[PDB]
Structure 1
């Protein structure tokens, strides 16, 4: 019904903003990126995505491309507004073709004035998902409105060629990732105990008493920080055993550094870099880490790494025999760090996410503390998870934002120094996030019914960068620089 459409015309306007009532990670920016492989996805009738053109224009159609658009028909209305507050329906009870993944036009008359155009979804012919790979408002008196956006047999036939191309590109992308879980990369740095130091692994290391109150340039990590109570897991595998290369307390405490992934910065800070690629700690782990694991045996390798023993602590809520057997009771981990870079590649639900502190027992995590920055947010979020009742329950707690990381300017920027404290006393865990010039944020977790005090559970702290992105490019990475890493425990009486 539109005799007057043109094959070519003026370029479409760039919206100044794309927003949405809700989404699952896959946000409304993905409507305007001229990319069929990305989508805005949102579940529920009446959820919307809105384009702001920044000023009032005349429009008479929209063009839209649909996720899985050759498998089901999407149901929707289109509304417009001049003021952004009240909405006029211009297209009602629309149904996509069900036959194509490309752009399809939905056109009306007369043209209307609008600054804002929104897609209101009513799910699809199979389920409740509103999933749209492209949306733009069009004025067919000035822009291209091509016949190829009315879905006929020839358009569907051309798409078979496009889909085959896209499938081939997908297989090529997969082939490029073949070395994902491999540790074959990185220079080799010296292990002190194998080269320059005779390490007495029958004995605990000396307690380092020199340490400067703030880290100094030119010091090894062990001269700026107490490294005697950690081992480091590195995501490369130079001894070819299929596992990370671990750096024992005796090597760490004697000045170990690796110039790519664990080293003293020009300003003294301790840098941890974690690529997406790397050998992982086990089959059941999806992600690489460059991360320290607490070792209260402090280099006395006669003491086993695992167990309620003199290498691990327990909560003071644990049975008496555990309190006495453990190396200490309760615990505080306090760190100061900045985030240098967060992954910017990968799927919408993983990109920019990693973990900067943990408590673990043999199986589960009393806490995992996350930072996450999205590529299109100017700052990042910090939040945590608490697993409970043998990990059959998991609860997320915000500190500065949450796992969605939609913090705008209100989060923690790259390069911004901040501190955290994780303080366990019995079945209470207090997590504090401290920032310069701002009030502390404090979350108290009641672990009463969490099951960490039953008996037999041993604990250790972790700190560093544990990636939570596997889908990103293999060389993409997250990096943090620490200025404080202080661990404390109480003693059994």
Structure 2
């Protein structure tokens, strides 16, 4: 077998969340030993790949199944996360190869978290459909209300894309393929100062129907920078 993704990529600052029955989480340490399964594997082109089925497990603060990386500043403490001040950036290149029957998955996020580690809302969701990418940014830190929608066209099922998600001083900057949009989330609602944040990338499958099928998403590069 080809080298597992945590041998190819530096995953020392991520944990992996799975769409198995008991929604399992593989620590950074285990990713580093070379964890691989039907959910997470190195494909023949080298890509780090998710398979998640729509009938998979979903946990307490998720309506849908995922095979997805969750950023761990401190591999042993998921309460260590970053905030609105300074600069925090994820860059990745990827492709979505298979969709569920909904035709929709999420391929990257910035998720909110409370200081005590409890559930908070998502801040940025990279919503992938064949030929429609919506980098949605939440407006209300309490989790009510609608998102600012940011639409990019022409990115097809199977196309390689380049993505950046940066937060600088409470402004979110969302970029597909050199097209950057921004949303001043901390200027829209000072409550965002009271929350912390971490990155996510992989396959969060927006379909939980019994007949939904499964989704495959790939990453060829993934890095996080905290200026």
Fold-level similarity (TM above 0.5): yes
Distance 2:202 2:88 in 1: 18
The aligned counterpart of 1:246 is: 25
Q: Shift of residue 360 of structure 1?
A: 1.0
Distance 1:272 1:425 in 2: 29
Q: Shift of residue 220 of structure 1?
A: 2.1
SS for the counterpart of 1:364 is strand
Which 5+ residue runs of structure 1 have no aligned equivalent? 1-216, 238-242, 317-328, 346-350, 374-379, 402-410, 435-439
Distance 1:467 1:452 in 2: 29
Q: How many correspondences in the alignment?
A: 219
Distance 1:413 1:361 in 2: 29
Larger radius of gyration: 1
What is the aligned counterpart of 2:209 among 471, 482, 489? 471
The aligned counterpart of 2:225 is: 488
What is the aligned counterpart of 2:146 among 378, 394, 401? 394
What is the aligned counterpart of 2:82 among 300, 303, 313? 313
Distance 2:62 2:193 in 1: 26
Q: Shift of residue 483 of structure 1?
A: 0.3
- Structure 1 consecutive aligned stretches of length 4 or more whose deviation exceeds 4 Å: none
TM-align CA RMSD: 1.8
Asked whether 1:454 is paired with 2:189, we answer no
Q: Shift of residue 449 of structure 1?
A: 2.0
Distance 2:73 2:7 in 1: 19
Higher strand share: 2
The aligned counterpart of 2:66 is: 289
- When residues 480 and 419 of structure 1 are mapped into structure 2, their CA distance, relative to the original with a 3 A threshold, is same
TM-score w.r.t. length of structure 2: 0.90
Contact 1:399/1:442, CA 8 A, preserved across alignment: no
- When residues 230 and 292 of structure 1 are mapped into structure 2, their CA distance, relative to the original with a 3 A threshold, is same
Asked whether 1:423 is paired with 2:166, we answer yes
Contact 2:15/2:71, CA 8 A, preserved across alignment: yes
Distance 1:451 1:266 in 2: 46
User: Which deviations, in whole Å up to 9, do the C-alpha atoms of 1:13-55 show, x marking residues without a partner?
Assistant: xxxxxxxxxxxxxxxxxxxxxxxxxxxxxxxxxxxxxxxxxxx
Distance 1:452 1:269 in 2: 38
Distance 1:488 1:446 in 2: 20
SS for the counterpart of 2:188 is coil
The aligned counterpart of 1:355 is: 106
Q: Shift of residue 472 of structure 1?
A: 5.6
- When residues 452 and 252 of structure 1 are mapped into structure 2, their CA distance, relative to the original with a 3 A threshold, is farther
Contact 2:139/2:148, CA 8 A, preserved across alignment: no
1:183-194 matched pairs, under 5 angstroms: none
User: Which deviations, in whole Å up to 9, do the C-alpha atoms of 1:343-393 show, x marking residues without a partner?
Assistant: 1x3xxxxx11110011111201220111013xxxxxx21112211221223
What is the aligned counterpart of 1:338 among 95, 103, 106? 95
Which 5+ residue runs of structure 2 have no aligned equivalent? 114-119
